[PDB]
Assembly symmetry: C3
Homo-oligomer: 125 residues x 3
Amino acid sequence: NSPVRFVKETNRAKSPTRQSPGAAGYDLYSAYDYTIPPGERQLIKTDISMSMPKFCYGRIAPRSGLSLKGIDIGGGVIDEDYRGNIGVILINNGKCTFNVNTGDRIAQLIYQRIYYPELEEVQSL
Amino acid sequence: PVRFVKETNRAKSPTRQSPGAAGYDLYSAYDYTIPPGERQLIKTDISMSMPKFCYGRIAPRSGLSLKGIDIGGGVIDEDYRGNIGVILINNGKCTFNVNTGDRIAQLIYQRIYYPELEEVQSLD
Amino acid sequence: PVRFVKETNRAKSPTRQSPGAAGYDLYSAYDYTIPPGERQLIKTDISMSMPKFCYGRIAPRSGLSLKGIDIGGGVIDEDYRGNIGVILINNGKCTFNVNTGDRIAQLIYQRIYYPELEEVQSL
Ligand SMILES: [Cl-]
């Protein structure tokens, strides 16, 4: 249980942070400026890449404030071996246009602990 | 032992019905009416002191999901000590009614990890 | 070790793609058609024994998510012993086709906790 290394791809990226010592996840921020109209989704870029911890995955989880405004998360499974610019799919299920500015908090990345079992085909259980 | 508090007598204590259930059932404490394409914050009138290296996920019941009732948000932080609400998204075509005492979700205590983040020049 | 059963020959063994993959790939055992703004329970014809202190999350493939396809429900409990279903929701603008054998989701074995609850008067 050592440090998770992350790379800022550009000067626009903000280091992920936990609000509080008991916060579930690390907050992710838009590196660019977007307009999402009602009934549309947009992949938002963080310009962050990280080497993910072992036996875990990163859940791109919703911030509750944005969810009460009708902003949900699409996809959001960051694999252990994924090394690219992390992106967040924001779904505007609200009634009017939602603006994403550079620096805006858009989601929380939770390091969810997972198992990698062997699968064995059987006749019955 | 996770301690919990009822804000009112209207709160139902979260239930666990079998050893192989993913978590605990959450129940509405109030009456609600959610029109099609609209979301509503359902108050459970339960607050709790959450265990270490976990978050509580407000997770969907399959039966409601199958009716087009999805879960908004739902990340209960370890140090969230307020009234637990369930954002129900009515993605069906009919008005969805929530009565006091109705099962609305399952709370799942999800084991997580809190790494230190160290910025580096490059990974690989 | 997890034991799984193919209910029909139309079922495909769940596989991980890479050693660092989060979930095991789930496939449609049948043909489906999903209208925009509608959902569909997809049958995998795979039933399995879930590990202890765990639940399977039916999680999205990010590629389908970019096309507007999302996952409904998806909590596979430890004592669920039936055909694993996948609720795909078509939140795109056009009809969605599912062909027998298509990759529809991934299953993530998510470690959980079964704590005791105790009512108190304050925290
Ligand atoms: Cl999850």
